[PDB]
DNA sequence: CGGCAGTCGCCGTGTACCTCTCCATGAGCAGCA
DNA sequence: TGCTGCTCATCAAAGCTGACGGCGACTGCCG
RNA sequence: AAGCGGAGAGGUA
């Protein structure tokens, strides 16, 4: 399995960042198997994709209100089950209104699951109209999401091998002439980090 | 360091011939690369 | 200090009534600390004569 | 300017005169330099060897 | 009916999920056997399940003579079907021999059926 | 956004010569008696 | 069935605490 | 025709 040379890595200042322009905390990551990185990602086909995507995520929240509504009764049910000695017969009222909220921690239960989902296809869709190339993808689940889902459109991986990857896939003739370009025309702390 | 590091790979291609799952494999390597970075430079970084 | 790990480790793994102090004590980090000391250390020192 | 130096750096003053003497000719773009001190430690390691 | 499909099923049964331990060389069988020991002691058998080291046997050639040897799958590996619980947790971790629990990132991972299965059917 | 001051890590710290000591272990696994 | 010769492995970690100046990345942090 | 490497301590100008 490919290594690094240790000389080009760890060294102040880290020569291998100034080349891929990453910081050294996330090449300490990286390397040393603790960190996703996503190394190409081919904009074409994720350009005229776009509509039925995320027509198939409204589905699936169709889905998701499916089994909502479903909840809903069910709990409006067992609630009526409560209640059906609430305020009409002899039981102490302290525990046959504290089910009330207990009631209404079940009613804030199918929320939960509701909102959940929400969240996990809205933040899956952002990252996947967000994906640029050298970017860190830590908690899996995430990376799981996005290689079962959109399982195309893009390559990522770990290690060594990855880093080997993004040294191949760079232009050093158009990195030169933007970093000229900011030296010639700029102010403040990008001149001098150009530089 | 010569020793520790031909024992490391032989061990990482045993485990990779025989269809081992992703999460040994690529600790195996995060082992070997450990090992390769302390051969050329022994305590630049962690323990020596 | 160092044998009361291994005595205390070693208590944890075996069977209830066969343990024995004549089998709970290691007494070889004692003498290796001792050899350690005696020799090859930096205040015992070569003599002048 | 058109003179293919990093701005920032340090050159040796011959060298300087020297393109510059060799820039106005087919064309025209003099570089701007400015005298530096150096300590003994810093003019050690920026040697050419 | 395929035997593989049948032991997957029956690991289904059982509860809990599977995690692997680094362990050292020579040391597989005695940090089985003080896990097992420890785990009956401290009265954490609600946690750990079942502590196994796949093993096969391989024909080692001793001056050309053909021997079954019995040869660990996974050299330093261990495999334990538990829950993650932190009681669990510490137990397993400070038992002689465990140096840690191998998985991504920081967060230890659960091996698939299938892998797992696929270390577990008699094969030496 | 825009600076910014404290912090943390790595670099260096005289030359030549003489004498003496010490340098891994613990468990495991055969091989006998 | 128990002394004793032959063999092998680097993942260890609870201990350590009396240097001091120069220089630069940088990083959380405040405005 | 056949070897000689590390660590520590004390001294001399």
């Not at chain 1, 090449?27 to 776009?50: C, G, P, Q, W």
């Not at chain 3, 089998?23 to 003599?47: C, D, H, W, Y």
């Not at chain 4, 020297?18 to 701007?32: C, D, L, W």
Request: proline share 4%; hydrophobic share 40%.
């Amino acid at each position: 399995a490919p290594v690094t040379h240790i000389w080009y890595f760890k060294g102040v200042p880290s020569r291998l960042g100034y080349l891929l322009d990453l910081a050294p905390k996330d090449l300490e990551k990286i390397i040393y198997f603790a960190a996703y990185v996503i190394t190409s990602v081919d904009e074409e086909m994720r350009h005229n994709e776009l509509s039925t995507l995320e027509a198939e995520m409204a589905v699936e929240r169709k889905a998701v209100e499916d089994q909502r509504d479903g909840e809903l009764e069910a709990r409006a049910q067992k609630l009526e089950a409560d209640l059906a000695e609430l305020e009409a017969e002899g039981a102490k009222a302290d525990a046959r209104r504290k089910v009330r909220d207990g009631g209404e921690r079940e009613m804030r239960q199918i929320r939960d699951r509701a909102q959940r989902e929400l969240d996990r296809l809205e933040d899956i869709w952002s990252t996947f109209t967000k994906l640029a190339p050298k970017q860190l993808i830590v908690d899996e689940n995430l990376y799981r999401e996005l290689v079962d889902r959109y399982g195309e459109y893009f390559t990522g991986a770990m290690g060594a091998e990855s880093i080997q990857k993004l040294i191949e896939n760079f232009d050093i003739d158009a990195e030169a002439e933007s970093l000229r370009d900011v030296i010639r025309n700029g102010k403040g702390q990008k001149k001098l980090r150009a530089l | 360091l010569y020793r520790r590091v031909i024992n490391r790979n032989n061990r990482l291609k045993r485990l990779i011939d025989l269809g081992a799952p992703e999460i040994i494999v690529n600790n195996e390597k995060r082992m070997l690369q450990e090992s390769v970075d302390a051969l050329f430079d022994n305590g630049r970084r962690g323990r020596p | 200090s160092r044998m009361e790990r291994v005595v205390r480790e070693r208590m944890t793994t075996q069977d209830v009534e066969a343990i024995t102090p004549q089998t709970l004590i290691n007494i070889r980090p004692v003498v290796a600390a001792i050899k350690e000391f005696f020799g090859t250390s930096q205040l015992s020192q070569f003599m002048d004569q | 300017g058109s003179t293919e130096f990093l701005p920032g750096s340090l050159i040796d003053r011959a060298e300087f005169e020297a393109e510059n003497r060799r820039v106005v000719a087919e064309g025209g773009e003099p570089a701007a330099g400015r005298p530096v001190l150096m300590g003994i430690t810093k003019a050690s390691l920026a040697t050419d060897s | 009916v395929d035997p593989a499909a049948a032991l997957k099923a029956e690991l289904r049964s059982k509860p809990g999920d599977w995690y692997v331990v680094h362990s050292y060389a020579g040391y597989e069988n005695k940090v089985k056997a003080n896990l097992e020991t420890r785990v009956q002691n401290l009265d954490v058998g609600d946690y750990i399940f079942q502590v196994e080291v796949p093993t096969e046997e391989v024909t080692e050639i001793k001056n050309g003579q053909r021997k079954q040897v019995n040869r660990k799958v996974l050299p330093g590996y261990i495999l334990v079907r538990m829950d993650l619980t932190d009681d669990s947790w510490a137990a397993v971790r400070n038992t002689p021999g465990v140096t840690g629990f191998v998985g991504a990132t920081s967060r230890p991972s659960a091996l698939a059926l299938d892998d797992v299965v696929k270390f577990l059917l008699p094969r030496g």
